[PDB]
């Protein structure tokens, strides 16, 4: 049975040390990737560092670098990362983990806390690009990293070569001009614009909007183009 | 009819100046909100500058604070933005544009562009969080900011108080144990995890991941929560 068990994590000051250890079992160690992932409270995955089966290559993103070294030490099936200069930032459940760059197996991981003793709304949108037939349904998604009212999510659209439109104020209240065919809904975090049915005109980028506080923030776009 | 027509723009130096002029007509200048959006070339909209109708309040982004300067003539409808310290990153085509914080109007916009004489791919979902019922379809929605084949775009789940675990190493390939209600399609920049029929244990977090190159980075999460 593959085991991946982490140790040596706890409280630490800013600038501190601390030094990581994964023991693994159940596995030719020497024939394996080795890695650390990370997950800061209440936040999304990163990857850490990684270290081929001999040590002949060592990986590292660039918020590490040149401040974490990985180690592995094969004669004891284990894997090391020595963090030095820590900040606030490295905060998370540091995961032992195999192989690279995908993780089949994850240890339980270890909590690291580096403490002395808001933010703008993000909008994403989805898909990137959609392929469709005249006449056909258009389903856009955007996504607000934080909560709005859907009184204050408005839709873009800009065709290609021309200045962007205003589409929607905010809900599904639409500028003049704009038909009906373009209803907007969603309230909180996930807001949608249909296009009921596809004229040729409609193929274009469109443009999600938050104009709740300062800065008003764009999503970055979804393109709508024909199949 | 309203007519917003902008001026000024061309090619500068970095570090030098630069002063926009739009032009209003068709509606009283002085009711109403004016303000200045760009658009890189080939990305997306940044509001960069707004002010109120009496000129009693400023607005600016932050990545242009301390360096650019909006004011107003009511007296002759005309809307200004003073540009200095510009940087390559300011290049872009600027749209004048009515009111704020959501743009009704916009003029067909100016040049500029700030000249001497690859990055890593970013990985959104959609949406933030799915509300579904036990037996229901779920539908889950990644986007590379850059392009991705099948055979690099992993998928992951985290069940409540666990750690990650691997779902599908790339195009709906499956790890060991997870079961076939999970599959995953997509090509290029626009992926979806399909969980035909929603277990009570299948109502967790769940993150895709590219491993085409290094960092191999994760998207920042769906919650398939009950409804």
């Known amino acids: 049975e593959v085991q991946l068990l982490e140790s040596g994590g706890g409280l630490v000051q800013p600038g501190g040390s601390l030094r990581l250890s994964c023991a693994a079992s159940?596995?030719?160690?020497?024939?394996?990737?080795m890695s650390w992932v990370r997950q800061a409270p209440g936040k999304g995955l990163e990857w850490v560092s990684s270290?081929?089966?001999?040590?002949?290559?060592?990986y590292y993103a660039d918020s590490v670098k040149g401040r974490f070294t990985i180690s592995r030490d094969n004669s004891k099936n284990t894997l090391y990362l020595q963090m030095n200069s820590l900040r606030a930032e490295d905060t998370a459940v540091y995961y032992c983990?195999?192989?690279?760059?995908?993780?089949?197996?994850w240890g339980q991981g270890t909590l690291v806390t580096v403490s002395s003793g808001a933010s703008e709304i993000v909008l994403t949108q989805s898909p990137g690009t959609l392929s469709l037939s005249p006449g056909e349904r258009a389903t856009l998604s955007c996504?607000?990293?934080?909560?709005?009212?859907?009184?204050?999510?408005?839709?873009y659209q800009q065709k290609p070569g021309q200045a962007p439109r205003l589409?929607?104020?905010?809900?599904?209240?639409?500028?003049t001009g704009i038909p009906d065919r373009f209803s907007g809904s969603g309230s909180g975090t996930d807001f949608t614009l249909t296009i009921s049915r596809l004229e040729p005109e409609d193929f274009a980028v469109?443009?999600?909007?938050?104009?709740?506080?300062?800065?008003?923030?764009?999503?970055?776009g979804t393109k709508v183009e024909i199949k | 009819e309203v007519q917003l027509l902008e001026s000024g723009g061309g090619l500068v130096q970095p570090g030098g100046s630069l002063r926009l002029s739009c032009?209003?007509?068709?509606?009283?200048?002085?009711?109403?909100?004016?303000?200045?959006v760009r658009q890189a070339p080939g990305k997306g909209l940044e509001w960069?500058?707004?002010?109120?109708?009496?000129?009693?309040?400023?607005?600016?982004?932050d990545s242009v604070k301390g360096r650019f300067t909006i004011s107003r003539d009511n007296s002759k409808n005309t809307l200004y933005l003073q540009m200095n310290s510009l940087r390559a990153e300011d290049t872009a085509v600027?749209?004048?544009?009515?009111?704020?914080?959501?743009?009704?109007?916009?003029?067909?916009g100016t040049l500029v562009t700030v000249s001497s004489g690859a990055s890593e791919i970013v990985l959104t979902q959609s949406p933030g969080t799915l509300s579904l019922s036990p037996g229901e379809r779920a539908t889950l929605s990644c986007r590379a900011s850059?392009?991705?084949?099948?055979?690099?775009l992993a998928w992951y789940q985290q069940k409540p108080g666990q750690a990650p675990r691997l779902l599908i190493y790339?195009?709906?390939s499956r790890a060991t144990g997870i079961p076939d209600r999970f599959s995953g399609s997509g090509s290029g920049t626009d992926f979806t995890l399909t969980i035909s029929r929603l277990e009570p244990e299948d109502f967790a977090v769940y993150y895709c991941?590219?491993?085409?190159?290094?960092?191999?980075?994760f998207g920042q999460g769906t919650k398939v929560e009950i409804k």
């Open positions: 270290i081929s089966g001999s040590s002949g290559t060592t």
């Open positions: 159940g596995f030719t160690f020497s024939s394996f990737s």
């Open positions: 991941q590219q491993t085409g190159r290094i960092p191999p980075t």
């Open positions: 983990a195999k192989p690279f760059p995908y993780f089949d197996y």
């Open positions: 790339y195009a709906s």
């Open positions: 850059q392009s991705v084949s099948s055979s690099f």
